[PDB]
Design a protein around this ligand. Sequence first.
Ligand SMILES: CC1(C)CCN(Cc2ccc(N3CC(=O)NC4(CCN(c5nc(Cl)nc6[nH]ccc56)CC4)C3)cc2)CC1
Lengths: 198, 244
Amino acid sequence: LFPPQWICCDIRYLDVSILGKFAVVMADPPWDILPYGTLTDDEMRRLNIPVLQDDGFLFLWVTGRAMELGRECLNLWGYERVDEIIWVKTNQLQRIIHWLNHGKEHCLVGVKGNPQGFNQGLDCDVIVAEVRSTSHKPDEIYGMIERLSPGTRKIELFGRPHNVQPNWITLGNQLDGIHLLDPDVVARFKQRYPDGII
Amino acid sequence: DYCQHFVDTGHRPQNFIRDVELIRLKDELIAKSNTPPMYLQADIEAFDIRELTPKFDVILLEPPLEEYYRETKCWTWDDIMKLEIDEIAAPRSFIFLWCGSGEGLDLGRVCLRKWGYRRCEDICWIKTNKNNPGKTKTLDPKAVFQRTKEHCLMGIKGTVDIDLIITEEPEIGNIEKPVEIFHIIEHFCLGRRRLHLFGRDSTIRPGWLTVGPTLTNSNYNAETYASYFSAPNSYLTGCTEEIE
Ligand SMILES: CC1(C)CCN(Cc2ccc(N3CC(=O)NC4(CCN(c5nc(Cl)nc6[nH]ccc56)CC4)C3)cc2)CC1
């Protein structure tokens, strides 16, 4: 079902098997590096990412010491890191916003299996875009991911309301309930959760 | 959406960044404090690194990656990992390691840990293609996107600038890294013993000891080099006046 779908929940406790397989996973985790609900490093290592894909791509936002930890989770979950996108943070005049001031944010790109029929090479590993709210990723990532893998099933982890997109199923704890339209998903959800509760 | 614009016209999004307090004293102070440039031809694979004394405050390491010769001796990360960097680093010191944009972003982190550093900064050289929008990039097999940048990783061991360098992409088979990396390092004021491994004649520079295989001349002398840091000069940051 092409239009947006989402599930308010805690990815720690949700049974992600009901969700099926996806061509692209994206996550922007709340690394313990706390102004919001943080996850520990073991909690991040234990996330059941491996069931989510058989052949596809993982897009994993990182920062600070998560740059290394995120590489660990990526490998633990069974992916190879094959690219790394950086988003250059500009203002409206297209000028750039520990030891150095950080003009950029990193997003690791992992691959798993033998994904085929993708359009590798269309975009380049730099995003230039204006900062919206704090902690918001740039919308360009979705256009990049759609050109890479058009029309396919995609899941986002640790999303918020604005993150909901067509072809995407968003998982987040600050979301407005459960909104599912794919029949195969709606089925396995009712089977696993008859009274809607995790 | 400059990403769609790149998919339309071939201009990398970084082409459109504009513009890419007088810290002039710092720079002058750096330049007053710089040791004379020293340099040594040395075939590093076959060269025992320990001969390089004293222990260095900063190490800049620029090994020739195969990927640097897209259309053109390359060092593998296998080779690089075996360099005995920890033996010539000072107990408190910094490393700046150019990692390319491929497996080096991972293997370079293994090296940093192997030699005893923790990464505190990831500096990106973003290459604009303003003078050749119509030149497509022959990608690495594992690549998912066109790769338009290179990473320089900053390591620390022991107790003004952004983390971005934007310049135009060098002509094919020019492997030079932006001189700006040197400004970013010197402005940190991390001390005066500064070694650049795999530099070339073109990278020699006041305040720096350069070692590489392609250097055409040497002037290096350990006792002479050490004299520049004997007391009362041993602990200078490189950002203060000369002791009278
Ligand atoms: C700069 C960037 C491009 C890169 C770095 N990053 C850093 C960052 C900042 C803020 C957040 N978060 C802020 C927020 O308020 N909520 C969350 C966390 C809570 N959350 C959950 N979602 C699910 Cl499914 N399970 C859960 N278990 C426990 C919680 C939880 C929903 C999203 C999102 C996430 C990452 C920003 C962009």
